[PDB]
Amino acid sequence: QNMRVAFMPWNGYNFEDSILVSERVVQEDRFTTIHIQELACVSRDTKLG
Amino acid sequence: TEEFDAIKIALASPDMIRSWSFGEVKKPETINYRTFKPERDGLFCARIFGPVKDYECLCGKYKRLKHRGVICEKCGVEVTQTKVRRERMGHIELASPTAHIWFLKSLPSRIGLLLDMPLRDIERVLYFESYVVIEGGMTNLERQQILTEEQYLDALEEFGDEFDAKMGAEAIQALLKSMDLEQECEQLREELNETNSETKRKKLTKRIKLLEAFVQSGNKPEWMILTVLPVLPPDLRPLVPLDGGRFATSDLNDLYRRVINRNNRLKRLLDLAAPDIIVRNEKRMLQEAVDALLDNGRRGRAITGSNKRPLKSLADMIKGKQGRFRQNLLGKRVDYSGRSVITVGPYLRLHQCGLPKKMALELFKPFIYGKLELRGLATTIKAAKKMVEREEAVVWDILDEVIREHPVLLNRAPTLHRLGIQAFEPVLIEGKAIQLHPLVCAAYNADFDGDQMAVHVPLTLEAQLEARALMMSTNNILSPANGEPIIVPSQDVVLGLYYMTRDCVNAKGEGMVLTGPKEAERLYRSGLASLHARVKVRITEYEKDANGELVAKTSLKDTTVGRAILWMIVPKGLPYSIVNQALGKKAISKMLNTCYRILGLKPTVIFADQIMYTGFAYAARSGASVGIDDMVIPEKKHEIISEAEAEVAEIQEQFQSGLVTAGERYNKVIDIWAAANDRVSKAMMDNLQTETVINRDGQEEKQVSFNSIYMMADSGARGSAAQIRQLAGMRGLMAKPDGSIIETPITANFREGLNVLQYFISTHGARKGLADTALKTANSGYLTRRLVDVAQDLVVTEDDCGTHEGIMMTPVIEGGDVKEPLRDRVLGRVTAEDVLKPGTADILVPRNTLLHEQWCDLLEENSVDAVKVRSVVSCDTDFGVCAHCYGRDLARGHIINKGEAIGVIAAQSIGEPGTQLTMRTFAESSIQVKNKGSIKLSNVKSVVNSSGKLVITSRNTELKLIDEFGRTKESYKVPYGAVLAKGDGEQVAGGETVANWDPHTMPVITEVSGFVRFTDMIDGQTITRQTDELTGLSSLVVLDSAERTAGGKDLRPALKIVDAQGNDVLIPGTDMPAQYFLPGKAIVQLEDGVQISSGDTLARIPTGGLPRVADLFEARRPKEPAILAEISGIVSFGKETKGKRRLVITPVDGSDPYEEMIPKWRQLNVFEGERVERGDVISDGPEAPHDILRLRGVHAVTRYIVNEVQDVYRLQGVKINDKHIEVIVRQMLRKATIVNAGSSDFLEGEQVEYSRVKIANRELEANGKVGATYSRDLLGITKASLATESFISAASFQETTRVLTEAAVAGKRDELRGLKENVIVGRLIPAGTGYAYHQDRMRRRAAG
Amino acid sequence: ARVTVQDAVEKIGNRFDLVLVAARRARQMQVGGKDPLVPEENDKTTVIALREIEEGLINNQILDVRERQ
Amino acid sequence: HARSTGSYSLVTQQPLGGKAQFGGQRFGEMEVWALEAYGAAYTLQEMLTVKSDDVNGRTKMYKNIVDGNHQMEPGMPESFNVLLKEIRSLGINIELEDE
DNA sequence: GGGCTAATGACGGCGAATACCC
RNA sequence: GCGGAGAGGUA
DNA sequence: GGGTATTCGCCGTGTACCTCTCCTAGCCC
């Protein structure tokens, strides 16, 4: 997604390649992804039953 | 746990194997796969190895703990704890005695040479193709004769009796049992006493050493052949049941099953008395199975079922990276550890780190439980667990309280040097990322672009003290490699500080006078003055001139507002001048440096934090950005490019006509393009650099611009001039795959757009760089691993050995100027003896004193040129080094402390740069004196001719430069035949051309004049006269020894120098008949009939980095070594043209018989009738350190290595202190070889330490008698590590099989004495905090 | 938090047995056989022992005399 | 990811490697060298035995920490014993001597 | 589903094992 | 469900 | 036979971490 960036050092919170982000980005819920895990329970046939 | 020491290794006897074993494993089955109970007598057997489940028999008759020694009557399984199933070993009784592959296939085949029979024969026997006649009675056959099938047949038919022969490993065992060790040893010694020939003497000495090892160690040779084979405890080779009725098994289970199968089938065949052929086949098969068990891979590589990968044998488990010592015994996987992504966290103090709440809770769980139980918040431990798993407010309060002073260790994946692990005090934060203090990133090489870090928790009280005292971030500000600071501000801080301190011609609040920095900030923050504007401010600086007292001087300085604002932070002791300048990267770094040297640690820490905060703040206030217009295309670029294109077009057209070759055109084009690139670069830098033409009150003026990209470049925050060029200029020339440079460069830049071709080319460049970094990284990691390995055991053990020895340290003046000054080269080394002022009896430095900054500056005030300093290599201490011989340099400032492991610090400091630099990468015609000085010639003997030249007749001639006050500024090496201008004494003006020479041509210089007379240069045999007319042109070719034709091989053409009358003019003072052997490629242009001038041209003659460092440290003969002289005296020639010309050095005093062969191609630099010194150069080329050590001695080779390595390292601009290279060199030459006799075996390679204690023992004895006299040896770090005393150290990283086999046969005993072994055994290292412990143990032995 | 131990290492210049004496003292302090000679400011016992060392009250010899007493 | 204590491996009694199973970080040989470069003997010692490989040491240390004491005994790492047993499994007798 | 039996695409370095030249 | 192969990725 | 080249074969080739599939084999009743 395309967001409004400004190139400047902002009290060393973007010191190294790190990135500063505005709470508005989380408010608009625009970098929230859905992930999906699969889990499996297997019931086999043992000789005890 | 017992308190032990001395790990002993030896051959296992069959009785010992029976001793370890609790039962025989007869059948290969393991488990019933139906009922998971194990086998009755199988790889997994309860009656042999132990009960599967704690304290309960298989059949279930006995289950109570009450029974502890009973063995159930139904199942013969004893009732004990299942843990024993991890230690109980089994055994297999082999029907046919089998050979142990390790003792056979190991490069020196010990079965082979022990029997003095080549390996080929052993192979013939083992694969059952041929026999060997063991004691074949009264016939015509010896005792180790290999016999083929039908030779055995005809022998047997002829000789029915007195013929005992057998086959296979059992035959070999028969040979081994019947051998008389001591008798053969004495016979062998007698043979050596009668035999004098090189190769046989070496093989013979090898055999006697093997025999001595057997008779001393107590191993009997027959034990190399296995009869009983032990089987590993089951839990060490598990057969785990995968979920789903399937099983997962180690490959050892497969190999053991195969061995048992072949053994049982061979047993059955023997019980059936099957024909010989089948039992022989079965014995062969059993051999393969067993040797696959022992070491799979020295045969047909028995692959596994349906997987094509070769399965892993026991030897594979030990040897190799993935297997063992490296993997599980030096590389464990700790508890109380975590990992996460690192983040900035600017607000942190230098000594702290942001740690996520949830990670902190998880790590410190048991601490939490303890504190919870102490306060009574939880009745029992399970309630504490439940309370932690709910995570109630009380839990977070307890976490805050326990975390308070508890420090954690932060580590970043490539722990290159010791600053890759540092301790911090954690501060609980939200989030899942670890927050890392910015200043320490440089130490970690950490970047916030997805780098992760691991966090360990020191548990014990001792660990806490070690982390907080020795390892904490604030205690490590100086790099252990060189003395310079590690925590220097990196990019935003330095950019902000630069912006703040730079001044501008005219701004708001120009030229107003301020009473102090405080109102400067009042003015700036209120917007009544620019952050940079020239102003007069009153400031009170403090200076500690007295004995630690601070004196305030308060005056008016002319500065900027910003510089005052910055001055607010600066601690008391520092002069104002420090901040008054532009304050870029270098300036800030040296600021921190001075703050450390003057004030000390704590003020430096606090000042660094302040620097970070102010830099970040004012960088943010600056608003520095990067727009497309911020990078200014030079206005005159297009003109420069069009001009260069016109020039290339003109040169190409003038080529197509054919007056210049292709190579000449190539060179010209490349040079003109390089010139155009430099021109455009300089124009762009002029445009961009000082472009702010802003106006003062009236007229205009010009100043260093405020272009954001320019400030980032100039400040040293990011980018160099080169990258600026690549942005705004033309991006220079490129290299094609093979290294050749494309004729047309890439004229476009990233501000503009490249096109497909230019992009593609730069793509090649980038790809090549990335591949290089990856390959280099692997090579460097190997090199540093070898380094840390070789030097691990070296520790500073003694305070002062008290030796007078030392190395003569000079400033390295390579050619043009002083690449490295004295002060850093000598800083922190103790002196070997007092150095005197330029006037005798004026001692400037007492006997050994540590040379700290003040002494070094004092030496700068005087004009001392060379200082003898104690070096680690010459240190006298036994089993380690002494503090004084080492010096001070550390992360702290003081003399080295007793106990410190200098080996590992040296190895790490020498290896980190090599890996780091690869990531970072991602003619000599005339001499030109640089500074006004006197010329001085060293090691020369000239004879002035009529033309007035100081003719150089010595190959080792040097031309140094003495300055006004007696100092050698410049130094050059002048070869034979170099035209000279000024002789000795003359004062040379600044930058005047004193010499001249042909770039691609070394002339041979005649000393006298007259006619050239041809002697033994007969026409047709070795030379072909093709001569031109009167003007004296010819093509007479005097070829060298190698290139001489087949007929003119022995006929040596010569040139006698005669005068106009005919008589050969003789060299002044000497009677020698001048017989000039024309050297290689002697083009005799000036034919007979032209009076030779002094200087006629006789013959025209037209690696670095990581591999070079690795080669120097491995001491690799560079395949074309230069040659040196052994003794002095008249050299002479000898028996001519055998295929390698003989040179016999004849000493005037010593014995003559030293002959050295020389290949034909070699040219000699010395005359026959010359006075050579020991170790002078005879041939040109790289010299192998071995020769330098042997002839010149220790200090010469160590100086050579140190300088040659330091050259490579400084070429890349990485500064390393010489002490580390010195420590490595000292570790290299740990060994000597004895030349005299008296207590040793007269030739054994033995470490110099034992030899020195042997000499001390002879001195202690009332009669010294023979003593021990020895010769030093220099070994490359791999071999040097291979010849270590401890066998665990050597097995830890090299071929495990070889060293293990050597130690097993030798019966070697390891007292551990070192670091890596002590690590492996899991006890305290003898270095640092644990040194005392080991010292205590030293007192514990041989005491009451 | 005690950010620098520079004065404690200036007391004993080896910088290694400093750790040993401080560990012995802090171990006598944690398992409550002894009492701190300095008013604690909610520090844990490690930093307490370092704070005591830097003030000159405790070293190895004081430990030996007090233990035999 | 973080762990205090959890499941350990079968043959060499070191804690599992990984994230799926709790798993500890690998204090590799380079990290060992880093600790050796300091005079950090006790940290390396605990890291080598009590933190990963020594069974009795790890359980005694858990109990000791819970009890609020931080002392510890080091003992011999189990992986070394596995090494001894494996080398002894060859025809090589390697014994831990005593005097 | 269950039971039983038994090939080719690295490279360097180094040191030992023949090939051969007297 | 400890392990080991193969594949991919991170720094 | 003894020294010198030349082939030959073994040993090594950076760390830390994170995902996925697949694991003794084959044939007949």
Ligand SMILES: Nc1ccn([C@@H]2O[C@H](COP(=O)(O)CP(=O)(O)OP(=O)(O)O)[C@@H](O)[C@H]2O)c(=O)n1
């Ligand atoms: N295959 C790899 C790739 C990287 N690394 C390591 O990860 C870091 C990346 O450096 P880097 O070059 O990516 C950034 P930096 O070094 O700080 O320079 P720059 O910011 O001016 O661009 C380095 O410490 C490497 O040692 C590794 O161990 N194996």
Ligand SMILES: [Mg+2]
């Ligand atoms: Mg990074």
Ligand SMILES: [Zn+2]
């Ligand atoms: Zn039973």
Ligand SMILES: [Zn+2]
């Ligand atoms: Zn010394």
